[PDB]
């Protein structure tokens, strides 16, 4: 696995890298839901439900990332 | 085994480029109405994560080789 060739150096840095990528992946998802509503491929109500559920998940990742960064001595 | 660091870096950049085009292709297929939503949300999310993992590892390996 090429993914395994360069990795963070300790479990907490791995957690931080996973939180960074998950939060970004959710923003990507929310952005294209907004683009799908403008194109009319989803309707308003299914749009607001998934954005709500995705934004709830992104808060938990963001709050966690704050705790992880402070526990590791990184800027916050 | 014994691949050069620049060879490993070419591999990883190529693996990042594949997932980016994969997820980009998924995205327009979904904006075209060609892909159902609850399919998209799970798989695109899961693939975007790996795309961001690879962007980071690419930047770290690039700075290792000292660009």
């Amino acid at each position: 696995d090429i993914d395994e060739v360069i990795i963070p150096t300790a479990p907490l840095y791995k957690q931080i890298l996973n939180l960074y990528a998950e939060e970004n992946a959710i923003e990507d998802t929310i952005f294209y839901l907004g683009e799908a509503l403008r194109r009319g491929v989803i309707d308003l109500d299914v749009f607001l439900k998934h954005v709500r559920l995705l934004s709830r998940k992104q808060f938990q990742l963001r709050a966690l990332m704050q705790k992880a960064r402070k526990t590791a001595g990184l800027s916050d | 085994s014994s691949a050069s660091l620049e060879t490993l870096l070419a591999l990883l950049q190529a693996e990042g480029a594949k997932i980016e085009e994969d997820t980009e292709n998924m995205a327009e297929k979904f904006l075209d109405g060609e892909l159902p939503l609850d399919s998209f949300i799970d798989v695109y999310q899961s693939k975007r994560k790996l795309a961001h993992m690879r962007r980071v590892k690419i930047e770290k390996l690039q700075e290792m080789v000292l660009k």
Partner: peptide, 19 residues
């Protein structure tokens, strides 16, 4: 930078190692 949405600069002090 601390916010993941402001780019990969958020990962600047995160150490990586080869294997």
């Amino acid at each position: 930078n601390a916010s993941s949405l402001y780019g990969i600069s958020a990962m600047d002090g995160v150490p990586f190692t080869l294997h």
